[PDB]
Coordinates of C-alpha atoms and ligand atoms in Angstrom, one line a residue:
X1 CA -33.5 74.0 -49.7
X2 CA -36.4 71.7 -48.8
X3 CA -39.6 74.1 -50.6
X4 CA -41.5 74.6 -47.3
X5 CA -45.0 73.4 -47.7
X6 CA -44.0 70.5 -50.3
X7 CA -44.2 66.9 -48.6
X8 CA -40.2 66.1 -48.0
X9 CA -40.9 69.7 -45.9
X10 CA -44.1 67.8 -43.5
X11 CA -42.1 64.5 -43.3
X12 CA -39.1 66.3 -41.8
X13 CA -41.2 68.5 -39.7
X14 CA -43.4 65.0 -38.8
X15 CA -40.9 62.5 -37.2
X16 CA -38.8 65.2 -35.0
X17 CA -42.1 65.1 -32.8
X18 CA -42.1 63.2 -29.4
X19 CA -45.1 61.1 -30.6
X20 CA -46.9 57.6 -30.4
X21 CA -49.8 56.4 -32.6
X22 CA -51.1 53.2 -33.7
X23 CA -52.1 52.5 -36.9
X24 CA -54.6 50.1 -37.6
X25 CA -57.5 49.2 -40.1
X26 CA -58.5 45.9 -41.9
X27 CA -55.7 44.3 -44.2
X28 CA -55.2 45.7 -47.4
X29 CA -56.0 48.9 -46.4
X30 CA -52.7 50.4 -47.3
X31 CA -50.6 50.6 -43.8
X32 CA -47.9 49.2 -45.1
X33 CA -47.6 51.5 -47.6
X34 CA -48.3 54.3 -46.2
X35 CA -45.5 54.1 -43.8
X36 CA -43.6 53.6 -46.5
X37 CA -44.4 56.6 -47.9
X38 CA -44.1 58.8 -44.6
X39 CA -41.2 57.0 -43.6
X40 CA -39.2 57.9 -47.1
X41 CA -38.3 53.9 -47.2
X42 CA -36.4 54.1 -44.0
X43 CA -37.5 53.0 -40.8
X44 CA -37.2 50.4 -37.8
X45 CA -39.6 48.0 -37.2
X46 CA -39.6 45.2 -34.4
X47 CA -42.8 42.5 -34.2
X48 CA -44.2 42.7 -30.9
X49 CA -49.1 40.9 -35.9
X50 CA -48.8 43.9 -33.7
X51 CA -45.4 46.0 -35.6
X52 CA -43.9 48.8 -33.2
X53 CA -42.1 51.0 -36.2
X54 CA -40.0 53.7 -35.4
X55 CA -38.3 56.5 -36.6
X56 CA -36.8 60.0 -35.4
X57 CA -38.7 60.3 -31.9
X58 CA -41.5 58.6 -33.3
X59 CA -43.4 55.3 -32.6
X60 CA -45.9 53.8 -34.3
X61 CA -48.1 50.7 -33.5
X62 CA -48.9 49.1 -36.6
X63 CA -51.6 46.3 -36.5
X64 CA -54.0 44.4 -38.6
X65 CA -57.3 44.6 -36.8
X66 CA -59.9 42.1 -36.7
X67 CA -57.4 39.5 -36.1
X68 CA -56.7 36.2 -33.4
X69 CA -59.9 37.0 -30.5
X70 CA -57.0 35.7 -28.1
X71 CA -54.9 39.2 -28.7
X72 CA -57.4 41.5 -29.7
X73 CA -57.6 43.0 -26.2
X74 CA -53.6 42.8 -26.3
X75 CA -53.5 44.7 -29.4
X76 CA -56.1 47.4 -27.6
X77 CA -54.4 47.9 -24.5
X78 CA -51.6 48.3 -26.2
X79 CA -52.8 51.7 -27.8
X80 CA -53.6 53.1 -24.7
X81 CA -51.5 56.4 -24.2
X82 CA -51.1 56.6 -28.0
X83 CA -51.4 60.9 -29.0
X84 CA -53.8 59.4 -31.7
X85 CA -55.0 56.8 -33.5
X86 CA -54.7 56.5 -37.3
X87 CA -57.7 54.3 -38.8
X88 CA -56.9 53.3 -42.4
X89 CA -59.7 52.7 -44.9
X90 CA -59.5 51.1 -48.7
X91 CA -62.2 53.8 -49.8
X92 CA -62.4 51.7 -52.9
X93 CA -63.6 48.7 -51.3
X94 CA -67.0 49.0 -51.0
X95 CA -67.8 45.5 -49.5
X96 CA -65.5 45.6 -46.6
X97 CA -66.8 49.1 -45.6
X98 CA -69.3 47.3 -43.3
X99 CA -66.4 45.5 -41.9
X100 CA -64.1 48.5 -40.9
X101 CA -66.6 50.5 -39.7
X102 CA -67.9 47.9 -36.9
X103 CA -64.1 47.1 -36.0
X104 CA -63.5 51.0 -35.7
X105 CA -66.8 51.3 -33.5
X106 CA -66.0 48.6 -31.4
X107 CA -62.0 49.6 -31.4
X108 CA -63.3 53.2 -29.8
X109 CA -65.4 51.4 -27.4
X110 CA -62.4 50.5 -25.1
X111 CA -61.8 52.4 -22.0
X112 CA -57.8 53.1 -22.1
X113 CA -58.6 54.4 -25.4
X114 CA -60.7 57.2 -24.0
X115 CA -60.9 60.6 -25.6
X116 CA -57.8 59.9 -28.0
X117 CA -58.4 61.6 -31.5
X118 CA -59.0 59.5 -34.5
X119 CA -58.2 60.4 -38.0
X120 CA -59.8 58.3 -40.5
X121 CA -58.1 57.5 -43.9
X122 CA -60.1 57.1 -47.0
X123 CA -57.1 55.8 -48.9
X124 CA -56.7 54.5 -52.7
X125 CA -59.0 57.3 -54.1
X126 CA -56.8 56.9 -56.8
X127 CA -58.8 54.7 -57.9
X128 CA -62.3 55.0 -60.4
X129 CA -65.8 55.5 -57.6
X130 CA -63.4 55.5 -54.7
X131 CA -65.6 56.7 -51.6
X132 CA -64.8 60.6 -51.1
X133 CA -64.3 62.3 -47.6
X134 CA -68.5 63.4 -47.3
X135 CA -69.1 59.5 -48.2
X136 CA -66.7 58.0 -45.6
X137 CA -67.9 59.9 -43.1
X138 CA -71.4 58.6 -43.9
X139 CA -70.7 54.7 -44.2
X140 CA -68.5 55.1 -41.5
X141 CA -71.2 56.4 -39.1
X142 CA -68.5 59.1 -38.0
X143 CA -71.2 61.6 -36.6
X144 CA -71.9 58.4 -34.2
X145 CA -68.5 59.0 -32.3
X146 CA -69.2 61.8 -29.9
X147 CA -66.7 61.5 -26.8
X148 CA -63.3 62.5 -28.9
X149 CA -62.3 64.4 -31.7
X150 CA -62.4 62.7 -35.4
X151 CA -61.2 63.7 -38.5
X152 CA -61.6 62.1 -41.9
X153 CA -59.4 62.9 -44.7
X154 CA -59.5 61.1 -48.1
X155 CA -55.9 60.4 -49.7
X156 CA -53.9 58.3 -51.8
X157 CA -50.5 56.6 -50.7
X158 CA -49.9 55.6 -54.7
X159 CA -50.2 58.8 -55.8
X160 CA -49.4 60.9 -53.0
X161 CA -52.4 62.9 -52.4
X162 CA -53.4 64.2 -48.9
X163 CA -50.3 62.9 -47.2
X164 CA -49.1 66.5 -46.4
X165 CA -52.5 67.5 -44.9
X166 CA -52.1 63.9 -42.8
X167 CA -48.6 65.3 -41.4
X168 CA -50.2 68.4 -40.2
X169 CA -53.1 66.8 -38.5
X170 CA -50.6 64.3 -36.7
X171 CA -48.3 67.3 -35.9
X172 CA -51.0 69.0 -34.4
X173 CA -51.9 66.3 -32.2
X174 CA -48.2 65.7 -31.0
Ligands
GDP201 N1 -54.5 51.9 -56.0 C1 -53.9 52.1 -54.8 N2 -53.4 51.0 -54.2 C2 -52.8 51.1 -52.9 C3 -52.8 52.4 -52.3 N3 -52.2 52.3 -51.1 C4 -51.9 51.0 -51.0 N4 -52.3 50.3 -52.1 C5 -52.1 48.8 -52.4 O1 -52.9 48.0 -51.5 C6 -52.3 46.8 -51.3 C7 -52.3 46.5 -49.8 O2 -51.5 47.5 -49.2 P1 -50.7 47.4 -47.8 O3 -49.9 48.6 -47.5 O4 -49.9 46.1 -47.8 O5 -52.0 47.2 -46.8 P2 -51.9 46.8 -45.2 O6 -52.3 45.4 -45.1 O7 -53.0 47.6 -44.6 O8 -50.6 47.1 -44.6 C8 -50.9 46.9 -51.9 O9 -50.9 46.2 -53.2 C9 -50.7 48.4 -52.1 O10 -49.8 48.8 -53.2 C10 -53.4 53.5 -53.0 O11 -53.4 54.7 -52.5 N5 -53.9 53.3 -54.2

């Protein structure tokens, strides 16, 4: 009996959707481990910098922005068709905020990538004076992006927090 509403219940619900996504944001930013988490451990994953993961009827495009000039339009026109796009923040690093912000600006100022919904992740706030959701929103410029829906949650891969509420928002957008 998998409690319905408790995280194992999302993840279950989560990868039986016929869905694509990419998941991108600056290194360090927690990806990695993030899948990990959603992904219970257990996944496939084929290089393509650029990682096409999958799992159940799910594909995700896993990438590092803000990498080799000669692939970045690659790695964009890649992402077109995705459902969503998933843009991972390290809330608690306040000096590369300026950094993920312009690469998410100028990442949402490609044409395939028209309209898709964004959901951005203010992850490790875990940690001591990491940026809340109100704040993210705010440094990000967020309120800037007018042509699509966004969404900005604030969670924590570590200690699990606001994965469940990241399920539902990607269900949704199946
Ligand atoms: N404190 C904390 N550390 C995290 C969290 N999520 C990821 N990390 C750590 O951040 C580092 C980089 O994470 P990684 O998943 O490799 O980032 P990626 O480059 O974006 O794929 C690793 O040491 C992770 O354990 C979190 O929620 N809290």
């Amino acid at each position: 009996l998998v409690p319905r509403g408790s995280l194992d219940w999302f993840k279950a619900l989560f990868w039986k959707e016929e869905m694509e996504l990419t998941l991108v944001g600056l290194q360090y930013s927690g990806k990695t481990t993030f899948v990990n988490v959603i992904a219970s451990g257990q996944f496939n994953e084929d290089m393509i910098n650029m990682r096409k993961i999958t799992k159940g009827n799910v594909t995700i495009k896993l990438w590092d922005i803000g990498g080799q000039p000669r692939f970045r339009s690659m790695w964009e026109r890649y992402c077109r068709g995705v459902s969503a796009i998933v843009y991972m923040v390290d809330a608690a690093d306040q000096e590369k905020i300026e950094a993920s912000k312009n690469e998410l600006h100028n990442l949402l100022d490609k044409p395939q990538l028209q309209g898709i919904p964004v959901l951005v992740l203010g992850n490790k706030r875990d940690l001591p004076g990491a940026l809340d959701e109100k704040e993210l929103i705010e440094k990000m410029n967020l309120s800037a992006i007018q042509d699509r829906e966004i969404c900005c949650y604030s969670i924590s891969c570590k200690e699990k927090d606001n994965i469940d509420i990241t399920l539902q928002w990607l269900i949704q957008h199946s």
